[PDB]
Write an enzyme that holds these catalytic residues in place. Structure first.
Site, PDB file in Angstrom:
ATOM      1  N   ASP A   1      -3.468 -10.446   9.038  1.00 62.49           N
ATOM      2  CA  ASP A   1      -3.416  -9.834  10.351  1.00 62.49           C
ATOM      3  C   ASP A   1      -4.233  -9.827  11.237  1.00 62.49           C
ATOM      4  OD1 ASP A   1      -0.999  -8.316   9.901  1.00 62.49           O
ATOM      5  OD2 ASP A   1      -2.490  -6.855   8.263  1.00 62.49           O
TER       6      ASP A   1
ATOM      7  N   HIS B   1      -4.859  -1.287  10.072  1.00 66.02           N
ATOM      8  CA  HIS B   1      -4.426  -3.133  10.461  1.00 66.02           C
ATOM      9  C   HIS B   1      -5.763  -3.624  10.678  1.00 66.02           C
ATOM     10  CE1 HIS B   1      -0.340  -2.315   9.076  1.00 66.02           C
ATOM     11  NE2 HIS B   1      -0.676  -3.308   8.535  1.00 66.02           N
TER      12      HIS B   1
ATOM     13  N   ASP C   1      -0.340  -7.551  -0.300  1.00 65.84           N
ATOM     14  CA  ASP C   1      -0.530  -6.686   1.085  1.00 65.84           C
ATOM     15  C   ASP C   1      -0.225  -4.893   1.363  1.00 65.84           C
ATOM     16  OD1 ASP C   1      -0.667  -6.572   4.506  1.00 65.84           O
ATOM     17  OD2 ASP C   1       1.256  -6.951   4.833  1.00 65.84           O
TER      18      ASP C   1
ATOM     19  N   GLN D   1       7.290   8.516   1.043  1.00 61.16           N
ATOM     20  CA  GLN D   1       6.559   7.836   0.321  1.00 61.16           C
ATOM     21  C   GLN D   1       7.357   7.674  -1.092  1.00 61.16           C
ATOM     22  OE1 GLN D   1       3.286   6.057   1.048  1.00 61.16           O
ATOM     23  NE2 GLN D   1       3.739   6.118   2.789  1.00 61.16           N
TER      24      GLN D   1
HETATM   25  C1  IYN Z   1       5.801   0.995   5.219  1.00 62.49           C
HETATM   26  C2  IYN Z   1       5.014   1.480   4.534  1.00 62.49           C
HETATM   27  N1  IYN Z   1       3.979   0.472   3.972  1.00 62.49           N
HETATM   28  C3  IYN Z   1       3.006   1.411   3.274  1.00 62.49           C
HETATM   29  C4  IYN Z   1       1.728   0.045   2.597  1.00 62.49           C
HETATM   30  C5  IYN Z   1       1.457   0.590   1.275  1.00 62.49           C
HETATM   31  C6  IYN Z   1       0.862   2.073   1.472  1.00 62.49           C
HETATM   32  C7  IYN Z   1       2.352   2.720   2.314  1.00 62.49           C
HETATM   33  C8  IYN Z   1       2.852   2.189   3.216  1.00 62.49           C
HETATM   34  N2  IYN Z   1       3.255   3.761   3.872  1.00 62.49           N
HETATM   35  C9  IYN Z   1       4.859   2.527   4.438  1.00 62.49           C
HETATM   36  C10 IYN Z   1       5.780   3.766   5.027  1.00 62.49           C
HETATM   37  C11 IYN Z   1       6.990   3.986   3.872  1.00 62.49           C
HETATM   38  C12 IYN Z   1       7.960   4.883   4.866  1.00 62.49           C
HETATM   39  C13 IYN Z   1       9.355   5.094   4.338  1.00 62.49           C
HETATM   40  C14 IYN Z   1       9.595   6.674   5.338  1.00 62.49           C
HETATM   41  N3  IYN Z   1       8.789   7.177   5.283  1.00 62.49           N
HETATM   42  C15 IYN Z   1       9.080   8.371   5.742  1.00 62.49           C
HETATM   43  C16 IYN Z   1       9.904   8.685   6.039  1.00 62.49           C
HETATM   44  C17 IYN Z   1       8.856   9.669   7.281  1.00 62.49           C
HETATM   45  C18 IYN Z   1       8.550  10.412   7.077  1.00 62.49           C
HETATM   46  C19 IYN Z   1       6.899   9.657   6.678  1.00 62.49           C
HETATM   47  N4  IYN Z   1       6.920   8.459   6.315  1.00 62.49           N
HETATM   48  C20 IYN Z   1       7.089   6.452   5.367  1.00 62.49           C
HETATM   49 MG    MG Z   2       1.460  -7.234   8.719  1.00 67.90          MG
HETATM   50 ZN    ZN Z   3      -1.154  -6.567   6.110  1.00 68.47          ZN
END
Ligand code: IYN
Ligand code: MG
Ligand code: ZN
Length: 313
Positions: A107, A68, A217, A269
């Site tokens: 952000d 960020h 985003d 993911q």
């Molecule tokens: C919150 C988020 N924002 C993103 C924005 C952009 C690109 C990729 C992004 N990946 C995540 C993580 C999803 C989370 C959903 C659960 N997940 C997990 C769960 C267990 C272990 C690791 N990751 C990852």
């Molecule tokens: Mg934000």
């Molecule tokens: Zn952002």
């Protein structure tokens, strides 16, 4: 006045594409942003001296966190640029002004922690702003910078146009709180599919800009796979530090923030592509057909995470 910004040839061509990566040369990112405002909005939209001073104060108020950070700001502004340039006539003069600025500021002063960590830590910001905690702070930091002497890039707007632009920026920045995304997209899905979506209805425009803001985003998922994969490392470097801070408060973090559970990243993911990313770009493509390359690139990255799980990487 007669002073265009011009990029090298590869950048001048590739910056028009949704999947462009702004590169590792931090000193070029202000120039890339001014370039995008000048083609997106006009050379007349902002006084160059004021815009330059605003940009450099915005940069100073992003912190050296893994994800960020200033590079994220500019990256999210480029995805917005690509959406505006592919939808020329759908947006007002004030929206073109507001939205690139909103993206650059969205952000501001992020610490690398979620709303949920601030609430569990009992951070002062969680008492000042009980929902969308970081996002109300980002908007607050945007108004602060706009009010520094020589930083009012909106000085030539009327009182009521200035109020409209700050209102476009405020809603665009609040909309980046992913907790608000789910409901926003369900409403947009129902509106589109029962044919009630009306772009002359301000409250509809607001929803569509909110979805644009989620799409910009999350735009890491819309890059070429090597950019997607290396950005994922920065995202998790933050999450796992928050997980560590949760364990210091005596709280088992969720698995996405627990470094002990790295093995689960591929499957995590996948869930995210299926539950958030693909639905986001799908609804955006229905409302704004020229954004289809964002959906195609996300689907390509979904299939790359499927490959990681199958041990083919
Ligand atoms: C919150 C988020 N924002 C993103 C924005 C952009 C690109 C990729 C992004 N990946 C995540 C993580 C999803 C989370 C959903 C659960 N997940 C997990 C769960 C267990 C272990 C690791 N990751 C990852
Ligand atoms: Mg934000
Ligand atoms: Zn952002």
């Amino acid at each position: 006045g007669l002073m265009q910004f011009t990029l090298p040839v590869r950048l001048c061509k590739e910056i028009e594409l949704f999947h462009f990566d702004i590169g590792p040369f931090e000193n070029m990112w202000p120039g890339i942003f001014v370039y995008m405002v000048h083609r997106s909005c006009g050379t007349s939209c902002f006084e160059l001296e004021k815009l330059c001073r605003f940009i450099m104060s915005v940069k100073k108020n992003y912190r050296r966190v893994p994800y960020h950070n200033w590079k994220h700001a500019v990256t999210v502004a480029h995805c917005m640029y690509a959406i505006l340039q592919n939808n020329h006539t759908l947006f007002t003069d004030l929206e073109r002004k507001g939205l690139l600025i909103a993206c650059l500021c969205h952000d501001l002063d992020h610490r690398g922690f979620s709303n949920s960590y601030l609430q569990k830590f009992d951070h002062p910001l969680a008492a000042l702003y009980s929902t969308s905690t970081m996002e109300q702070h980002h908007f607050s930091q945007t108004v602060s910078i706009l009010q520094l002497e020589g930083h009012n890039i909106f000085s030539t707007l009327s009182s009521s146009e200035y109020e409209q632009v700050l209102e476009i920026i405020r809603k665009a920045i609040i909309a980046t709180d992913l907790a608000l995304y789910f409901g926003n997209r369900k409403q947009l899905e129902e509106m589109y599919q029962t044919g009630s979506l009306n772009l002359n209805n301000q409250s509809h425009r607001d929803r569509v800009i909110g979805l644009m803001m989620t799409a910009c985003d999350l735009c890491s998922v819309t890059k070429l796979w090597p950019v997607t994969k290396l950005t994922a490392n920065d995202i998790y470097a933050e999450f796992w530090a928050e997980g560590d801070e949760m364990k210091k408060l005596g709280i088992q973090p969720i698995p996405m923030m627990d470094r002990d559970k790295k093995d689960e990243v591929p499957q995590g993911q996948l869930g995210f592509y299926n539950a958030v990313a693909i639905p986001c770009y799908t609804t955006l493509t229905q409302i704004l057909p020229p954004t289809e390359p964002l959906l195609k690139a996300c689907r390509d990255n979904l299939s790359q995470w499927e490959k990681v799980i199958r041990g083919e990487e």
